[PDB]
Structures are given as C-alpha cells and as structure tokens.
Amino acid sequence: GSTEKQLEAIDQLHLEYAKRAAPFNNWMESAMEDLQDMFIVHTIEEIEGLISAHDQFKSTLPDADREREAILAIHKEAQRIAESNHIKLSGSNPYTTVTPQIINSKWEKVQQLVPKRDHALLEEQSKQQ
C-alpha cells in the first residue's frame, strides 16, 4: 500500500480539520483573551453589557462544544490510518498545527474562565446601583 495515497486521502480530511479548527482556534483565543483580562466598568450599562457578553457566550458554548467534537470527528478518519499503518506524518498536522489535546484543553481553559468571570460580573453588578 503506497503511503502517499493513505496520506492523500486523509489529507483532504486534514483540509476540513484545518478549515474548522481555524475559526475555532481564533474563537478560543479571542474568548480566552477577554476572559483572562479583568474587566473594568464605569457605569451600570457597561456592567450589564459585559454580562450580555457572557449571555451570548452561554449560548455559543454548547454549539462550539459540539464543534470541538465535530473536529475530532474529522480527525478520527485522518488519524485512524496512522493508528493502523506505519505512515510518516510530518508532525501533528500539515495545514493546521493543532493537536486534539491542544483544542480540548484550550476549550477547558475557556470553560474554567467562565465561572470566574460570571462570578465577578454578578458581584460587581450587585455592588453598583
């Protein structure tokens, strides 16, 4: 079995991985960035608006959550060949340098920052007016 074909057929799967992991890696980063940073508010409108940013987050989470699983759902086809045949992949991925753990643990980082911000938001908003 020519390795090139076993890589080529799953490289088109790497294609879909790179296509979906791309916005997801951007999303996780932007979210983690904002979630990491301590929010500063002046007026009450900003304190609620910041919470609205968590509102729409609580709705996107379950969707992007399944997205992470759907990304592994692409990798299962492209990885199973490497797990059965002694192929020679050039590292983790040719198009998108993301490992399953990197995307999963990044999600876990996003999730862990959710309550921290959700707590600070409500505490701050309750100390407002």
User: CA of 120: how far to CAs of 40, 54, 82, 123, in Å?
Assistant: 11, 12, 45, 5
Q: Are the beta carbons of 119 and 51 closer than 8 angstroms?
A: no
Return d(Cα 98, Cα 119) in angstroms, integer: 31
- Domain with residue 67: its CATH number is 1.20.58.60
Ramachandran category for residue 89: left, alpha or beta (phi over 0 → left; psi -120 to 50 → alpha): beta
Give the residue numbers spanning the domain of 18: 3-129
**CA dihedral (10, 13, 19, 23) positive or negative:** negative
DSSP classification of residue 90 = S
Which residues in 98-117 are b (16+ Cβ under 10 Å) and which e? Answer: beeeebeebbeebeeeeeeb
Number of domains in the chain: 1
Please state, in angstroms and rounded to a whole number, the distance separating the CA atoms of residues 61 and 6: 35
Residue with tokens 């399944």: 66
Method: NMR
